[PDB]
């Protein structure tokens, strides 16, 4: 399948070169998979989600996304126009308030929630969790991400936006999950992207168009935007049967575009997420 005039990041993940604008992908499109977006919520009524998104949990007075961040990330996972895996099921877990903040205790509870809640959902092709969040190093936060992964969920986490080594941030620094840095449309490391040996992969993260609250759209930047590209890619590849939740990060690294990014610090992987789809 071909989506013309796609957001640059979608075109990038199906291309061996920057500078194109058509996204190519297998029509299975993540059908039968599920992606949890652990964030500020999801505006599930947005036409772009086509009834495939729902809120399943909140720790606050509402499950609605009063911020936009979670809706944007969910759109990059799975919206019809802005999403990688256009037929996946999206489940929102609101661990962040409408200012975008959350206590680590709530974030940990949300991860353990997903590890159990997947047993209440129909995801025959597999389960992914996208975590566009983080703060300073916490062994308890890392352990929660490790449990979620161990339970059979492909966990993708943002590297962080500090232009620093991600070893000092959580859950970015957890070795067993997929830690995602950000790149721009010219294949440069995004100016804010964290780096370091704990990164597994880069995805598009600068000037990413996606859904927003109020039935709208906007372009924003962050490792928060790169993470759902990888989460949606994992769901798409799991639906194709090419990998599993336990092996998808490694598979994405195996099949990535290699050595194509600029300003990658010595010791950080030079790997850009790629779907290897041959039309």
Strands laid side by side in the 201-204 sheet: 53-58, 89-94, 33-39, 126-131, 153-158, 178-183, 201-204, 271-272, 257-258
Is 14 a residue of the active site? no
109-139: burial string, b at 16+ Cβ within 10 Å, e else: ebbebbbebbeeeebebbbbbbbbbbbeebe
Q: Closest Cα to residue 85, out of 69, 74, 70, 71?
A: 74
Any binding-site annotation on 98?
no
Known binder of ligand: residue 260? yes
Catalytic option among 39, 65, 97, 98: 39
Is residue 278 included in any domain, yes or no? no
Residue that is written with structure tokens 């941030």 in the block: 169
Is 175 annotated in a binding site? The answer is yes
Structural domain of 26: 2-272
Alpha carbon 108 to its chain's center: 18
Resolution of this deposited model, Å:
1.0
Q: Residue 182: beta bridge partners? A: 203
> 141, 7, 188, 18: which is closest to 80 by C-alpha?
7
165: annotated active-site residue: no
Tell me, yes or no, whether 11 lies in a domain.
yes
Domain count, the chain: 1
* Signed CA dihedral, 20, 26, 31, 35: sign only: negative
Residue 47 lies in a domain: yes
Residue 173 counted as domain residue = yes
Catalytic residue, chosen from 15, 33, 173, 224, is: 224
Strands 216-220 and 23-24, bridge-based pairing: unpaired
Which candidate, 136, 132, 138, 137, places its Cα nearest to that of 155?
A: 132
**Which tokens hold the place of 83?**
């999403």
Is 109 inside any structural domain? yes
Q: Which of 46, 69, 72, 229 is catalytic?
A: 69
Is 228 flagged in the annotation as binding? no
Give the integer Cα–Cα distance in Å for 10 and 249. Answer: 18
Report whether 265 belongs to an annotated binding site: no
**Do 184 and 206 touch, CB atoms closer than 8 A?**
yes
The experimental technique behind this entry is: X-ray
Domain assignment present for residue 279? The answer is no
Q: What number of helices (H) and strands (E) belong to the chain?
A: 6, 15
Q: CATH number of the domain that 139 lies in?
A: 3.40.50.200
In a domain, 182, yes or no: yes
* Residue 190 a catalytic site member: no
DSSP conformation class of 207 = S
Q: How far apart are CA 13 and CA 135, in angstroms?
A: 27
| 136 inside domain | yes
**How far apart are the C-alpha atoms of 235 and 85, rounded to whole Å?**
7
* Whole-angstrom distance, CA of residue 91 vs CA of residue 173: 25
């Amino acid at each position: 399948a071909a989506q013309t005039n796609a957001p640059w990041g979608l075109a990038r993940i199906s291309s061996t070169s920057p500078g194109t604008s058509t996204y190519y992908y297998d029509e299975s499109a993540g059908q039968g998979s599920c992606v949890y977006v652990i964030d500020t919520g999801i505006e599930a009524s947005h036409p772009e989600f086509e009834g495939r998104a729902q809120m399943v949990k909140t720790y606050y007075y509402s499950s609605r996304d009063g911020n936009g961040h979670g809706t944007h990330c969910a759109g990059t996972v799975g919206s019809r126009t802005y999403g990688v895996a256009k037929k996946t099921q999206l489940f929102g877990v609101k661990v962040l308030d409408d200012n975008g903040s959350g206590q680590y205790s709530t974030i940990i509870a949300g991860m353990d929630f997903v590890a159990s809640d997947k047993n209440n959902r129909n995801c025959p092709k597999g389960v992914v969790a996208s975590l566009s969040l983080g703060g300073g190093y916490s062994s308890s936060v890392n352990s929660a991400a490790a449990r979620l992964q161990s339970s059979g969920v492909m966990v993708a986490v943002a590297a962080g936006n500090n232009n620093a080594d991600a070893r000092n941030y959580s859950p970015a620094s957890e070795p067993s999950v997929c830690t995602v840095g950000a790149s721009d449309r010219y294949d440069r490391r995004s100016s804010f992207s964290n780096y370091g040996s704990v990164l597994d992969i880069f995805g598009p993260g600068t000037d990413i168009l996606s859904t927003w609250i109020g039935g709208s759209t906007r372009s924003i930047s962050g490792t928060s935007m790169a993470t759902p590209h990888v989460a949606g890619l994992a769901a798409y590849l799991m639906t194709l049967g090419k990998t599993t939740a336990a092996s998808a990060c490694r598979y994405i690294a195996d099949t990535a575009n290699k050595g194509d990014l600029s300003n990658i610090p010595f010791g950080t992987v030079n790997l850009l997420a790629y779907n290897n789809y041959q039309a």
